[PDB]
Design a protein around this ligand. Structure first.
Ligand SMILES: [Mg+2]
Ligand SMILES: [Mg+2]
Ligand SMILES: [Mg+2]
Ligand SMILES: [Mg+2]
Lengths: 360, 249, 273, 358
């Protein structure tokens, strides 16, 4: 069931095409995250939906009703700002009741709704305090309660938890996901953080320079990238070069990678002489001894640096050709059999069917 | 201690003449140089003087009216500049800056020639217009400085919550800008009560204020009745400032 | 809403400030008349008369008298603003307010009070003799020194406030970085603080120099007939002799100086930002 | 011994920020002061730098007292959080300010400034104001300005906090290499634990103006001293236990959460004493269903599986009512991974790999 349908959205600001052309659909009852580098244009889409900006050309729907030109006062869309946009003189109670008062709500219902909204975010006893008497985590909850009390069809969040510390951010990442399920309305989130998007979202859209690169579930993004930018942006990847020699069967293809031959799993059709990119992640590579290898063929290289990062050990490995390859693994210092040698000939291997093959 | 002593010297510099004219009010000597006893005669003679009291009333009326109109126009202009973002804002700021940093003699003679090229008699209206003209920039600067210390996203937040513009200017901006409005009113009142140069150019015999009345008496000699007027004006001007803070609170 | 406020404020300024100024500059080029004031005859006699020695010595005297008053305000005003910036935030507004309380009494009465305070047989001469600092009475009335004392009195508050605003907007880490790198208090002032607060100095100078060249009641009451300011010259031509074109020619010199100081302000701001 | 602090106290607005602090900073090392927000690290840094005066105690630098010496006469330079960066000077003059203000002959100013700019890879941006540069450039200018006076100790105050995530990872290694190149001691104040683990040679943990632990990055993560340091550096699982008998000099039998197991204890204990057993989330294994005479020790249900990209966190619930929060890698293309949700499960560890606290 579609809720917002953007068709042919364009916008130009000061002789700059921020949004060339965008087609997007937002369903009902999900958590959606717009993620990308700085300056890709997520805030423009958010403001166009909210109504604080007007589109140069295109069409916008909400529940099969055209709101392209309806002003940003009659739409059923509410927004949470980055700076929390709080009125200083008003109290918490009046901050929450602002939207209800300017909707001509009957006076009898105002107090129970406001108290319920404050209870939803655990702030029922700070009703009569004012801002500047509250911490950041409290002001954020006041903003969310002010946005949610009008029963909107859609809630927009713009980098909401950016200014906070680590553990408090981790805890509110979970309360927001619980609140979305408790209410039952669509959330649209804009963030620059990768792990934050991967944790709390049910559908991720990656944006670069005003265009959509990939849309899918978090697993479909971290595990099956579509191009090189998406693979390198979320997570961290190793780029290998390949040339196709021959095909054995429908799903296994022989090719050389950096001067060594091994089998790779390719599903789409290829022809001999074609160049490919084989992508592997740090946690999927294994460094093993070659003196008693007697297992299979693999890459040869030396270990230059061993970095201790707490829970994980990151190793920088130099191949014979000269490309940098980095391997990650857990640190078990109480294991008697733990490799620690440096500047030695050791092999690099990976388990079959764990690669991501992308054509060029 | 040396830092505190320097600050006292500057305050003692400005306040000593006021103390002298307050004390010499009760002096019996007409010239005021020496001290020759305590008399109350000057206050009684002032009470029976008509032209002096009329001039004082005219000055106070001009001050109040000019302060009110300047406060209104400047507050509206400051809200206009702060609320919107447009291409012409630096130009308006520059014009206001140039108006503020201009000689008073040029501004007086320009208004004289303008009012003589339009056949407007010199009196109430010319004086009121001149005072408003040279009081506006300070009000604009005060209110703009006060408003720029707050986030501008609150207006967008009010829009998203379903508030029209007039509601936004009747519920958000005004309570945050009232203490600046009171200060603008007080500053304009002081500036209109202090000026001597413009008034001596753009006025006429029909409307007489304290500056030219005292200037006329200078050629003959200033009686200590003037000192008796200055001390009362201090108390009356004091309570007006006290009232303004309470109303704004 | 948006258009009404902008048109009214722009219409008010163009009608009352800018257009009349173009009338003054255009009046300096026409020809005098007894009953018609200005007559439409383009002449350059007005500007060339300013080069006569009689009317050129008066202009030179005013510049020296105003320049020293500006310097005296800067020397006594920068330390006052600096010390007010090292005080608790609650007491600062009260101290600033106590600078405009004297302004409620009119300016023409406060100079009259100061004249009595500085007279030969008045106070500040009896007290000094009683203390014994001086031996014979000090006579400074009707001298160039008296005018400069009076001008500093009236216009000192106008210089303090621009300087205090610039000082309070300074960044504390910038002052701490210099101290770390080996700067004495003197070298921090010459190389960091003064360049960062230069627009505040130029703003204060404009508000104290130009108004000090038009105060005619200081010269009349404290200076005499030998020590005159430009405002006395303009006043006579506009209200007693009724030679209006000459008054416009004299007032141009004040306008020309305004442009030079304004240009410094724009150039000082661009470099700083 | 470079800087020795003895009995330093400081009070600000009546509230104590440093009760009593003893510390020794050696020569040629990287030291990081790590702790929660508002614990008095910045006060220590400013006290060493000379921008604040102590209320009691002594500060020494190469066995000469510098308690009352002003900041201009100390051989310590500081990099500020906001990159002070005087706006009216070029980069060349910014770097040469300190040399110019110590009465240095004019022949040596240009080569020294050029070399300092070269060490931070800014030799070509010599004539540009500090508003045409980006964050990294400004940071490198600040570092070059600090290190051109040849100081005996460089102080850094949350230097790389405002940058992005990849530039941070690059400049951490860059600074770690620069320290070895120069040969002087660095003191760094940080709020991020990963930076302290990956960049430091000695970490000092502070809380409420007091020292909690001091040692190698390995020691803090692997051998915490009290319950605060664990759970601040990473995630911890605190299990209660009761000692029964001492099997030998190394292993002691105990009752953990109502079940018996053998644990390693390295100090004297007596039956009845209460013990704390701490285990990292990644050291715990949720193995197959309970097999007789194969796996024993704990019983619990999964109750959740959270996906976080590289790793997968499962918060299991025991029989008593406690969470355990197991962590592990996510291998999807491996055809034996378990996706079970709410049945009987087993919790084990490796008979060691545990930290026992008294
Ligand atoms: Mg481990
Ligand atoms: Mg896979
Ligand atoms: Mg995986
Ligand atoms: Mg261990």
């Amino acid at each position: 069931s579609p809720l917002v349908q953007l068709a042919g959205i364009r916008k130009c600001f000061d002789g700059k095409e921020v949004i060339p052309q965008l087609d997007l659909t937002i369903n009902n009852g999900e958590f959606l995250t717009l993620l990308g580098p700085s300056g890709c244009g997520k805030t423009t889409v958010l403001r166009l939906i909210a109504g604080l900006e007007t589109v140069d050309s295109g069409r916008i729907m909400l529940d099969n009703e055209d709101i392209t030109h309806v002003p940003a006062e009659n739409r059923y869309v509410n927004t949470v700002f980055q700076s929390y946009a709080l009125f200083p003189h008003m109290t918490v109670f009046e901050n929450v009741a602002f939207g209800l008062r300017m909707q001509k709500t009957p006076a009898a219902e105002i107090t129970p709704r406001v108290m319920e909204a404050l209870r939803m975010v655990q702030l029922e006893t700070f009703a009569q305090r004012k801002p500047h008497q509250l911490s950041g985590g409290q002001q954020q909850r006041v903003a969310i309660a002010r946005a949610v009390v009008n029963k909107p069809r859609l809630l927009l969040l713009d980098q909401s938890l950016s200014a906070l510390d680590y553990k408090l951010r981790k805890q509110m990442q979970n309360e927001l996901k619980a609140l979305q399920r408790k209410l039952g309305i669509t959330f649209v989130f804009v963030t620059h953080d990768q792990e934050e998007a991967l944790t709390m979202s049910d559908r991720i859209v990656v944006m670069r320079d005003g265009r959509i690169e990939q849309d899918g579930t978090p697993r479909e993004i971290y595990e099956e990238p579509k191009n090189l930018f998406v693979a390198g942006f979320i997570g961290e990847i190793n780029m290998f070069n390949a040339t196709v020699i021959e095909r054995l069967d429908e799903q296994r293809v022989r090719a050389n990678v950096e001067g060594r031959e091994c089998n790779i799993y390719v599903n789409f059709a290829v022809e001999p002489g074609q160049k490919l990119h084989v992508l592997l992640r740090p946690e999927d590579l294994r460094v093993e001894e070659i003196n008693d290898d007697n297992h299979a063929e693999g890459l040869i290289g030396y270990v230059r640096e061993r970095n201790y990062k707490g829970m994980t050990l990151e190793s920088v490995v130099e191949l014979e050709n000269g490309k940098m390859v980095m391997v990650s693994e857990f640190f078990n210092e109480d294991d008697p059999d733990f490799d620690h040698s440096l500047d030695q000939k050791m092999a690099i291997n990976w388990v079959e069917s764990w690669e991501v093959v992308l054509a060029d | 201690l040396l830092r505190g002593g320097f600050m006292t010297a500057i305050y003692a510099y400005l306040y000593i003449p006021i103390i002298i004219l307050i004390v010499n009010s009760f002096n019996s000597s007409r010239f005021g140089i020496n001290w020759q006893g305590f008399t109350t005669k000057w206050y009684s003679l002032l009470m029976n003087n008509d032209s002096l009291l009329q001039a004082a009333q005219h000055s106070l009326t001009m001050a109040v009216f000019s302060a009110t109109f300047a406060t209104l126009i400047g507050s509206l202009t400051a809200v206009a500049l702060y609320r919107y973002r447009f291409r012409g804002k630096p130009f308006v700021s520059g014009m206001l800056f140039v108006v503020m940093m201009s000689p008073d003699i040029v501004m007086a003679i320009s208004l004289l020639v303008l009012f003589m090229l339009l056949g407007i008699q010199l009196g109430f209206w010319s004086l009121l217009f001149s005072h408003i003209t040279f009081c506006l920039p300070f009000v604009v600067v005060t209110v703009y400085s006060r408003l720029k210390g707050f986030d501008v996203r609150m207006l967008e937040a009010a829009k998203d919550l379903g508030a029209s513009e007039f509601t936004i200017l009747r519920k958000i901006i005004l309570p945050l800008a009232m203490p600046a409005v009171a200060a603008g009113w007080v500053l304009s009142f002081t500036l209109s009560m202090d000026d001597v140069v413009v008034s001596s150019f753009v006025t006429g015999p029909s409307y007489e204020i304290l500056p030219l009345k005292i200037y006329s008496m200078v050629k003959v000699g200033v009686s200590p009745e003037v000192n008796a007027l200055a001390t009362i004006l201090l108390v009356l001007s004091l309570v007006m400032v006290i009232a303004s803070q309470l109303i704004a609170r | 809403f948006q258009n009404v406020v902008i048109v009214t404020i722009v219409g008010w300024l163009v009608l009352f400030v800018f257009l009349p100024n173009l009338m003054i500059i255009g009046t300096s080029f026409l020809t005098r008349d007894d009953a018609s004031f200005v007559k439409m005859v383009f002449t350059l006699d007005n500007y060339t008369r300013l080069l006569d020695p009689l009317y050129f010595e008066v202009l030179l005297h005013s510049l020296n008298m105003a320049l020293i008053a500006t310097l005296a305000c800067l020397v006594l005003g920068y330390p006052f603003a600096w010390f007010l910036a090292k005080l608790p935030h609650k007491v600062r507004p009260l101290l600033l307010f106590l600078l405009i309380v004297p302004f409620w009494t009119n300016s023409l009465i406060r100079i009259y009070g100061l004249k009595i305070f500085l007279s030969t047989k008045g106070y500040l001469n009896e007290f000094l003799l009683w203390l014994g600092v001086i031996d014979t009475p000090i006579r400074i009335m009707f001298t160039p020194s008296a005018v400069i004392i009076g001008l500093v009195y009236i216009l000192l508050p106008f210089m303090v406030m621009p300087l205090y605003s610039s000082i309070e907007k300074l960044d504390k880490p910038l002052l701490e970085a210099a101290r770390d790198l080996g700067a004495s208090k003197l070298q921090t002032f010459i190389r960091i603080i003064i360049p960062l607060t230069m627009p505040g100095i130029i703003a204060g100078c404009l508000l104290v120099m130009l108004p000090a060249m038009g105060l005619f009641y200081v010269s009349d009451l404290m200076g005499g007939a030998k020590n005159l300011l430009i405002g006395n010259v303009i006043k006579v031509q506009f209200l007693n002799i009724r030679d209006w074109p000459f008054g416009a020619a004299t007032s141009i010199t004040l306008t020309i100086v305004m442009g030079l100081m304004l240009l410094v302000y724009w150039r000082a701001s661009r470099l700083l930002n």
